[PDB]
């Protein structure tokens, strides 16, 4: 019953210079399972932050 994944994949800065064999160099996305507070810390700008 969970929804799908609407991802706009972008292959920016891709080149074909006969660079040996095809391979990946960078990959990132913006999804995650929910997480629980493990630790926390304070930064000297004022803002606390939990990890």
């Amino acid at each position: 019953g969970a929804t799908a994944a609407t991802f706009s994949l972008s292959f920016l800065n891709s080149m074909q210079q006969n660079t040996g064999a095809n391979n990946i160099v960078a990959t990132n996305q913006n999804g995650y399972k929910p997480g629980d507070l493990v630790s926390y810390q304070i930064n000297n700008d004022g803002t606390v932050v939990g990890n």
Partner: peptide, 11 residues
């Protein structure tokens, strides 16, 4: 700000 990029140098 000096940076050493991870880009692939062009031919």
């Amino acid at each position: 700000p000096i940076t050493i990029p991870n880009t692939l140098m062009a031919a």
